[PDB]
Design an enzyme around this catalytic site. Structure first.
Site, mmCIF file in Angstrom:
data_model
loop_
_atom_site.group_PDB
_atom_site.id
_atom_site.type_symbol
_atom_site.label_atom_id
_atom_site.label_comp_id
_atom_site.label_asym_id
_atom_site.label_seq_id
_atom_site.Cartn_x
_atom_site.Cartn_y
_atom_site.Cartn_z
ATOM 1 N N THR A 8 3.476 -6.423 6.274
ATOM 2 C CA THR A 8 4.658 -5.528 6.531
ATOM 3 C C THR A 8 4.234 -4.049 6.620
ATOM 4 O OG1 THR A 8 5.609 -6.691 4.686
ATOM 5 C CG2 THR A 8 6.491 -4.495 4.877
ATOM 6 N N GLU B 263 4.949 22.375 12.507
ATOM 7 C CA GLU B 263 4.033 23.206 12.258
ATOM 8 C C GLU B 263 2.567 22.305 12.515
ATOM 9 O OE1 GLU B 263 4.858 26.833 10.294
ATOM 10 O OE2 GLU B 263 2.987 27.042 9.526
ATOM 11 N N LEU C 205 7.238 20.428 9.213
ATOM 12 C CA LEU C 205 6.670 19.210 10.034
ATOM 13 C C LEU C 205 6.143 19.558 11.256
ATOM 14 C CD1 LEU C 205 8.797 16.167 8.874
ATOM 15 C CD2 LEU C 205 6.601 17.016 7.643
ATOM 16 N N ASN D 23 -10.046 3.147 3.110
ATOM 17 C CA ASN D 23 -10.328 2.553 1.728
ATOM 18 C C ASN D 23 -11.792 2.527 1.291
ATOM 19 O OD1 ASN D 23 -7.879 2.553 0.394
ATOM 20 N ND2 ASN D 23 -7.371 0.360 0.759
ATOM 21 N N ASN E 90 -5.429 5.315 -5.545
ATOM 22 C CA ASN E 90 -4.315 5.896 -5.175
ATOM 23 C C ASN E 90 -4.099 7.320 -6.051
ATOM 24 O OD1 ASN E 90 -3.774 3.618 -3.596
ATOM 25 N ND2 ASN E 90 -2.229 2.737 -5.189
ATOM 26 N N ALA F 134 0.727 -1.108 0.046
ATOM 27 C CA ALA F 134 0.047 -0.044 0.027
ATOM 28 C C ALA F 134 0.880 1.418 0.091
ATOM 29 C CB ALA F 134 -0.999 -0.025 1.220
ATOM 30 N N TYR G 90 -6.921 -0.169 -7.465
ATOM 31 C CA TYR G 90 -5.870 0.487 -6.608
ATOM 32 C C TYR G 90 -5.279 1.559 -7.551
ATOM 33 C CZ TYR G 90 -5.758 -3.224 -3.110
ATOM 34 O OH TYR G 90 -6.083 -4.299 -2.109
ATOM 35 N N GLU H 75 -6.987 -8.156 9.451
ATOM 36 C CA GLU H 75 -6.369 -6.805 9.356
ATOM 37 C C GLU H 75 -6.787 -6.026 10.763
ATOM 38 O OE1 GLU H 75 -6.312 -6.410 4.448
ATOM 39 O OE2 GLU H 75 -6.755 -4.526 5.903
HETATM 40 N N1 LIG Z 1 -5.480 2.357 -0.652
HETATM 41 C C1 LIG Z 1 -4.881 1.306 -1.089
HETATM 42 N N2 LIG Z 1 -4.881 0.261 -0.271
HETATM 43 C C2 LIG Z 1 -4.110 -0.828 -0.515
HETATM 44 C C3 LIG Z 1 -3.375 -0.785 -1.732
HETATM 45 N N3 LIG Z 1 -2.734 -1.973 -1.835
HETATM 46 C C4 LIG Z 1 -3.165 -2.842 -0.484
HETATM 47 N N4 LIG Z 1 -3.920 -1.986 0.140
HETATM 48 C C5 LIG Z 1 -4.717 -2.199 1.263
HETATM 49 O O1 LIG Z 1 -3.695 -2.741 2.278
HETATM 50 C C6 LIG Z 1 -4.268 -3.746 3.191
HETATM 51 C C7 LIG Z 1 -3.130 -4.947 2.778
HETATM 52 O O2 LIG Z 1 -1.967 -4.484 2.952
HETATM 53 P P1 LIG Z 1 -0.758 -4.551 2.198
HETATM 54 O O3 LIG Z 1 -0.092 -3.134 1.808
HETATM 55 O O4 LIG Z 1 -1.247 -4.875 0.814
HETATM 56 O O5 LIG Z 1 0.189 -5.740 2.772
HETATM 57 P P2 LIG Z 1 1.983 -5.389 2.822
HETATM 58 O O6 LIG Z 1 2.051 -4.242 3.474
HETATM 59 O O7 LIG Z 1 2.557 -5.438 1.621
HETATM 60 O O8 LIG Z 1 2.315 -6.798 3.986
HETATM 61 P P3 LIG Z 1 2.321 -8.286 3.507
HETATM 62 O O9 LIG Z 1 1.865 -8.413 2.072
HETATM 63 O O10 LIG Z 1 1.328 -8.768 4.441
HETATM 64 O O11 LIG Z 1 3.724 -8.843 3.694
HETATM 65 C C8 LIG Z 1 -5.834 -3.836 2.550
HETATM 66 O O12 LIG Z 1 -6.434 -3.275 3.291
HETATM 67 C C9 LIG Z 1 -5.681 -3.480 1.004
HETATM 68 O O13 LIG Z 1 -7.050 -3.354 0.652
HETATM 69 C C10 LIG Z 1 -3.205 0.312 -2.641
HETATM 70 O O14 LIG Z 1 -2.511 0.189 -3.531
HETATM 71 N N5 LIG Z 1 -3.982 1.466 -2.226
HETATM 72 MG MG LIG Z 2 2.635 -7.449 0.646
#
Ligand SMILES: Nc1nc2c(ncn2[C@@H]2O[C@H](COP(=O)(O)OP(=O)(O)OP(=O)(O)O)[C@@H](O)[C@H]2O)c(=O)[nH]1
Ligand SMILES: [Mg+2]
Ligand SMILES: Nc1ncnc2c1ncn2[C@@H]1O[C@H](COP(=O)(O)OP(=O)(O)CP(=O)(O)O)[C@@H](O)[C@H]1O
Ligand SMILES: Nc1nc2c(ncn2[C@@H]2O[C@H](COP(=O)(O)OP(=O)(O)O)[C@@H](O)[C@H]2O)c(=O)[nH]1
Ligand SMILES: COc1ccc2c(c1)CCCN2c1nc(C)nc2onc(C)c12
Ligand SMILES: [Ca+2]
Ligand SMILES: [Mg+2]
Ligand SMILES: [Mg+2]
Lengths: 54, 427, 437, 332
Positions: free
Chosen positions: C145, C254, C252, C206, C228, C12, C224, C183
């Site tokens: 992550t 501020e 920052l 989201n 995004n 994300a 996404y 989550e």
């Molecule tokens: N807004 C937005 N949400 C995202 C995106 N990609 C993943 N998510 C959200 O993030 C959550 C999943 O976490 P991720 O960031 O995909 O997982 P990660 O941080 O890579 O961690 P792991 O894959 O578990 O190692 C879910 O709620 C998704 O809907 C994105 O590109 N934009």
């Molecule tokens: Mg991942």
């Protein structure tokens, strides 16, 4: 009502407007908690290998 | 993220071979291993199941194991037989006699270390091995007894890797020998401890689908394995093709298994097809969703209305409306909300893949973790006890060194599994 | 001039960093090879955009950014995509296997193996800074992550850069687009461990972005990419003051002074208007009054909640485009007589307004139409605590049966950290309630 | 099938509403805490509005308006009436009221111009002519309670020289239509009114339970509108609509238009309706005063059927349609 601290510049302006006045852990502690988690993972694995040896 | 595939025993190798046939066609690999497909999507994650070789040949990351050579000569003779690595054929001569004990303790012990040598050779090549999938039956001797011995030893050598199995459950309706409840009960105990994920493929369910639905008066193992290969293609779709999801075996386990021992999934498929019979009409997305949740499309003979869904995975295959898939999927949950535990919010997740399987314009594959799966284990438990209370047929096992205690323990562990499923059904 | 380093963590965070840096480049006139013709000080400078971009002697303008993910697929797309030449390879850090949606795998087992590498790559950007302000950290709550590695990264930045501010942009989990059942666990765990280490955090639900795309962009099923590009516009609004001449929110520090009078209650609610579809062939342009009024409609907020049933502690208006103070004050006076805007008694009732005259920039062939004026409102309202309530409820539902907990205990985490994190959330909810009634 | 959940097991009104829903064949009731519901008939205390409207694929509706408690607590209703220019402060249909705390000088100011004017100077929490006992009372209780000018010249029905209050049932739907049930009820005293003894309890308080003569003049100390209108005609040469109901409609429309901006769910991710009980007092000049607004009202047994069916028609089926109007719409 009152505008204050009006700042102007070429690319914009800012200001404030008031409607009414009022009425950490150290590095060793972290590396300690990260190592407590690893021991616990190590123990859990030793139990699995002891169990499979049986 | 490579998977190492193992197929063990007669059943293990017959469904295993059909799996490699079906996915090799989806990925555009001919029986010689040359790629002649048409879309880069077929190659994007072919690494998961295939090694590359000289001449850009694709070789299945597959190990073929049996205690008699019969069915493995048949694989080598089969259509895609020439695709497998010859060194990965590991067989003995004496067979296992439909005897779990010969598979696990005596005959299989002679052969297990040679299998582990091949597994090690395949693991050591992997950039980042995610884990193992095993194909086998639980009612015979090799796949059941030797298969679970392999799983135990693989876990010893790769304790931090995922172990996934496709396990075929015996049924009196499709039965080789009367000792299948013994072999299945001893194996289920192994499966409960040493896998993260097992698809419970039930020959009772497959027989019934072929008879009642598919209109096959006298089904063959070929008709059953057509249902199995369609299910194995569907439940690995997200592992083999690029998607929004980019799924692996470990995230599948993390999200499907809320309690370590309750990892026995009920797969389902829609639309249901018999071999040779082509369906000319498309299923609408509403029909895919209704059929895929239908008890009659389940590959484990359990009534899901007799239990509750812990978690559900649904994979849709084809060019279709993602909005319509969402609405229909949401529509199933809202209208049947009592059948999904309220204490795991949002426990139904959906994946879509653009590539349909061969011969369908649309398909749906269902992976459910239902407490109704206890019905299957109770059915085997009853058949086991009917023999065991008279200690019938046990000499085949005590003559390979096993003791009655080991049976008593195996029974008890499976009854515990049943009541554990019962515990979350009333929660 | 004081530099800011952006850190993008997990899928994300990485994908949203792509969106923002693409937009920053269009806004500042930086080409994808990293050249910027309008900048006549070759090799360096202390202009406002150098807050986010360093300079090479060959004219390249390099984001002060590091991308970090525990798995290579997503950052591999940055390494090969349109802006590949923009980033130095040392800025793109990938492991081999991800956290499997598991906070404890991200924080403990895998995080411990890669934390030192990330910190040294961060150290290499800080060393190029004459006066580093702090960090902007982009991540999801729900990913393993995103949640688990960020919290460890945050603990260490506090140790290594004790006197520097840290801002978060945090994606709050929505079931319509998440595919991870755990989550809520990850969100509570990371929020608890990070709370003391974060000075100001902008939550983006989201679910809010998804409906804005559905309702206002006429996108049947947003991806996404849709989400995004809209998120990056909001982030751009918030960071514009760091990157442009101006008097409001220039450092920052501020952000904390203007938006956060109490340290733990540091989650300002963002509201953005107007969001207009590029496919709309006829569109009447919205006035200052119309878009300022839009800031108090819940359907335009980054988190759906009802500010009418909370209290404000601080409130900023960030305008971009054709806007002059006269129209803002006229619009504010009208809104005040028609809306429920109560402040806490120990705070003045007022708006801090910033105006940049350059209208919002839009990605060519994206979904957002070009508009003549836009606004992002940043308000710190107790109403945002509804999102904590929602999350905490889902956490309680699962934890009561200890569902999935074994996956966390198996990476070396203790069951006690679940209840420790949950107790902190319970305290958080009670702080908002005290301030709010 | 639509789905609903029931979280107020004591609500007489919604007990009936859920039976009506179930007997439609098109509504299934779910376990209390199942979140996949269409309709929430919610708890009265701490209803989790922040959890509503976050289930994709479910339009969600709830039978309470968040914020409406400002109108339905006695302390809040006074503050709302003195501070909102839409009403205050010479709002002429609310009794002169003041909020008082126990651990006030404005109230003494009017009480003293009352005494200097030697006018009627009796107030209510619980009734008295001397503020001292109203206050010697307030602190030996331990809670906030407003005190209010007691209406010393109330309209009295004959025979009986009896006091009464009028309860009106008002339904506000998700569109903020204001619906007044055409049936009201008069809750009567069966004791003759007594100017000279306020400690004497029953003849002053017209509460259906606090009458324990009960039943002498009409069943249940409840007179409905057909009989009250008939009485006003034979007794006073006017109708109920003209002499009383115009003011009731003005007061209802006024109170609810005031809080519209603060409670409306027009642009919200979840939607609200709510049933209210308005309690009125009529004096001997046929002037209507608002006493109190009740956020979780019960009904009268005669009217339960008709009103609940109408709650389904206008409030629930307007949002979830199925497969001769008992309300008067108050226009705004
Ligand atoms: N807004 C937005 N949400 C995202 C995106 N990609 C993943 N998510 C959200 O993030 C959550 C999943 O976490 P991720 O960031 O995909 O997982 P990660 O941080 O890579 O961690 P792991 O894959 O578990 O190692 C879910 O709620 C998704 O809907 C994105 O590109 N934009
Ligand atoms: Mg991942
Ligand atoms: N200012 C006033 N003048 C005259 N009578 C009054 C009065 N205030 C209250 N009363 C009488 O007191 C009774 C109870 O008053 P209150 O207004 O305290 O409601 P309650 O909480 O007692 C029950 P409900 O909520 O159904 O009205 C009313 O029925 C009315 O007869
Ligand atoms: N579905 C299916 N089941 C099979 C097949 N072959 C055998 N079985 C079942 O598996 C059990 C017999 O085990 P088998 O694999 O032949 O024994 P093994 O060779 O020792 O592993 C019985 O329950 C059979 O019904 C097959 O091709 N398909
Ligand atoms: C019930 O919550 C689930 C179910 C499953 C999964 C996830 C979450 C997350 C990603 C992995 N994952 C999957 N993994 C595989 C191999 N195949 C799949 O098909 N659909 C899904 C979804 C899916
Ligand atoms: Ca420069
Ligand atoms: Mg056989
Ligand atoms: Mg009351």
């Amino acid at each position: 009502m009152e505008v204050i601290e009006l700042n102007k510049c070429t690319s914009g302006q800012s200001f404030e407007v008031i409607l009414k006045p009022p009425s950490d852990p150290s590095l060793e502690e972290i590396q300690k908690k990260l190592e407590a988690a690893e021991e616990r993972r190590k123990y859990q694995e030793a139990e699995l290998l002891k169990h499979l040896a049986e | 993220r490579e998977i190492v595939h193992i197929q063990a025993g007669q059943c293990g190798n017959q469904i295993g071979a059909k799996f490699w046939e079906v996915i090799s066609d989806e990925h555009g690999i001919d029986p010689t291993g040359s790629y002649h497909g048409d879309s880069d999507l077929q190659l994007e994650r072919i690494n998961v199941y295939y090694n590359e070789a000289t001449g850009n040949k694709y070789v299945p990351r597959a190990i073929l194991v049996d205690l008699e050579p019969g069915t493995m000569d048949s694989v080598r003779s089969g259509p895609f037989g020439q695709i497998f690595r010859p060194d990965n054929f590991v067989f003995g001569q004496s067979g296992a006699g439909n005897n779990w004990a010969k598979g696990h303790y005596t005959e299989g012990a002679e052969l297990v270390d040679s299998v582990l040598d091949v597994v090690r050779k395949e693991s050591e090549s992997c950039d980042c091995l995610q884990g193992f999938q095993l194909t086998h039956s639980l009612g015979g001797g090799t796949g059941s007894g030797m298969g679970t011995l392999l799983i135990s030893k693989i876990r010893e050598e790769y304790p931090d890797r995922i172990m996934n199995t496709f396990s075929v459950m015996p049924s009196p309706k499709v039965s080789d020998t009367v000792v299948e409840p013994y072999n299945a009960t001893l194996s289920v105990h192994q499966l409960v401890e040493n896998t993260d994920e097992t698809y419970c493929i039930d020959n009772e369910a497959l027989y019934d689908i072929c008879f009642r639905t598919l209109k096959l008066t006298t089904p063959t193992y070929g008709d059953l394995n057509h249902l199995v290969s369609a299910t194995m293609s569907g439940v690995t779709t997200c592992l083999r093709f690029p998607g929004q999801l980019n799924a692996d075996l470990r995230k599948l386990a993390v999200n499907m298994v809320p309690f370590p021992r309750l990892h026995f999934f009920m797969p389902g498929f829609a639309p249901l097809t018999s071999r040779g019979s082509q369906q000319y009409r498309a299923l609408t997305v509403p029909e895919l969703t209704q059929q895929m949740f239908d008890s009659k499309n389940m590959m484990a003979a359990c009534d899901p209305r007799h239990g509750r869904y812990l978690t559900v995975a649904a994979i849709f295959r084809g060019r279709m409306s993602m909005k319509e898939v969402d609405e229909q999927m949401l529509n199933v949950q809202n209208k049947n909300s009592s059948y999904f535990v309220e204490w795991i919010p949002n426990n139904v997740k959906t994946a879509v893949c653009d590539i349909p399987p061969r011969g369908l314009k649309m398909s749906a594959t269902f992976i459910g973790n239902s407490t109704a799966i206890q019905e299957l284990f109770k059915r085997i438990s009853e058949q086991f006890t009917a023999m065991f209370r008279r200690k019938a047929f046990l000499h085949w096992y005590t003559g390979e060194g096993m003791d009655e205690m080991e049976f008593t323990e195996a029974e008890s562990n499976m009854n515990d599994l049943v009541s554990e499923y019962q515990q979350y059904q009333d929660a | 001039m004081r530099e800011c380093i952006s850190i993008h963590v997990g899928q994300a965070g990485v994908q949203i960093g792509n969106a923002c840096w693409e937009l920053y480049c269009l806004e500042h006139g930086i080409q994808p090879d990293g050249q910027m013709p309008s900048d006549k000080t070759i090799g360096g400078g202390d202009d406002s955009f150098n807050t986010f971009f360093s300079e090479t002697g060959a004219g390249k303008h390099v984001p002060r950014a590091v991308f970090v993910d525990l798995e290579p697929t997503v950052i591999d797309e940055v390494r090969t995509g349109t802006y590949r030449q923009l980033f130095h390879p040392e800025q793109l850090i990938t492991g081999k296997e991800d956290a499997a949606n598991n906070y404890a795998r991200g924080h403990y087992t895998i995080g411990k193996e890669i934390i030192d590498l990330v910190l040294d790559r961060i150290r290499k950007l800080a060393d190029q800074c004459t006066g580093l302000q702090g960090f902007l950290v982009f991540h999801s709550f729900g990913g393993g992550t995103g949640s688990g590695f960020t919290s460890l990264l945050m603990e260490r930045l506090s140790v290594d850069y004790g006197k520097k501010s840290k801002l978060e942009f945090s994606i709050y989990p929505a079931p319509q687009v998440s595919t991870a059942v755990v989550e809520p666990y990850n969100s509570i765990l990371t929020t608890h461990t990070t709370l003391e280490h974060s000075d100001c955090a902008f939550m983006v639900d989201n679910e809010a972005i998804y409906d804005i795309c559905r309702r206002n962009l006429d996108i049947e099923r947003p991806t996404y990419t849709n989400l995004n590009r809209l998120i990056s516009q909001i982030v751009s609004s918030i960071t514009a003051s760091l990157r442009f001449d101006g008097a409001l929110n220039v450092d920052l520090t501020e952000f904390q002074t203007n938006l956060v009078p109490y340290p733990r209650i540091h989650f300002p609610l963002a509201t953005y208007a107007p969001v207009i579809s590029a496919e709309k062939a006829y569109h009447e342009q919205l006035s200052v009054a119309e878009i300022t009024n839009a800031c108090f409609e819940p359907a335009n907020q980054m988190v759906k909640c009802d500010p009418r049933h909370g209290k404000y502690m601080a409130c900023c208006l960030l305008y971009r485009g054709d806007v002059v103070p006269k129209d803002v004050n006229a619009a504010i006076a009208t809104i005040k007589t028609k809306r429920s805007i109560q402040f806490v008694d120990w705070c003045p009732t007022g708006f801090k307004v910033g105006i940049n005259y350059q209208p919002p920039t839009v990605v060519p062939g994206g979904d957002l139409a070009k508009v003549q004026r836009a606004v992002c409102m940043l308000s710190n309202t107790t109403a945002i605590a509804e999102a904590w309530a929602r999350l905490d409820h889902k956490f309680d539902l699962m934890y009561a049966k200890r569902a999935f907990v074994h996956w966390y205990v198996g990476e070396g985490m203790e069951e006690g950290e679940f209840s420790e994190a949950r107790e902190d959330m319970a305290a958080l909810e009670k702080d908002y309630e005290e301030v709010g009634v | 099938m639509y789905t609903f959940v029931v979280r107020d097991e004591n609500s007489s009104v919604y007990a009936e509403v859920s039976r009506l829903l179930l007997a439609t064949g098109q509504w299934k009731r779910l376990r209390k805490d199942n979140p996949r519901f269409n309709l929430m008939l919610g708890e009265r205390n701490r209803l989790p509005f922040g959890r509503l409207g976050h289930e994709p694929g479910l339009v969600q509706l709830v039978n309470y308006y968040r914020g409406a408690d400002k109108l339905c607590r006695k302390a809040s209703l006074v503050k709302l009436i003195k501070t909102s220019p839409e009403l205050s402060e010479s709002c002429t249909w609310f009794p002169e009221s003041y909020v008082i705390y126990p651990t006030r000088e404005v109230f003494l100011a009017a009480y003293n111009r009352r005494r200097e004017g030697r006018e009627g100077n009796v107030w209510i929490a619980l009734i008295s002519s001397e503020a001292s006992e109203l206050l010697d009372f307030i602190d030996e209780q331990g809670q906030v309670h407003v005190i209010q000018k007691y209406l010393e010249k109330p309209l009295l029905l004959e025979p009986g020289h009896r006091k009464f209050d009028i309860r009106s049932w008002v339904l506000v739907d998700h569109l903020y239509n204001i619906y007044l049930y055409r049936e009201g009820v008069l809750r009567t005293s069966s004791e003759p009114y007594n100017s000279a003894n306020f400690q004497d309890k029953t003849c002053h308080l017209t509460n259906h339970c606090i009458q324990k003569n009960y039943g002498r003049y009409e069943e249940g100390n409840e007179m409905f509108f057909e009989e009250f209108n008939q009485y006003l005609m034979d007794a006073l040469n006017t109708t109920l609509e003209n002499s009383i109901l115009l003011q009731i409609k003005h007061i209802i429309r006024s109170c609810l238009m005031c809080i519209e901006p603060a409670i409306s769910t027009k642009h919200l991710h979840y939607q609200s309706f709510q049933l209210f009980g308005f309690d009125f007092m009529v004096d001997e000049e046929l002037k209507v005063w608002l006493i109190e607004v009740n956020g979780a009202p019960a009904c009268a047994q005669k009217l339960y059927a008709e009103l609940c069916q109408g709650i389904v028609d206008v409030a629930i089926s307007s949002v979830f349609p199925l497969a001769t109007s008992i309300f008067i719409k108050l226009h705004h």
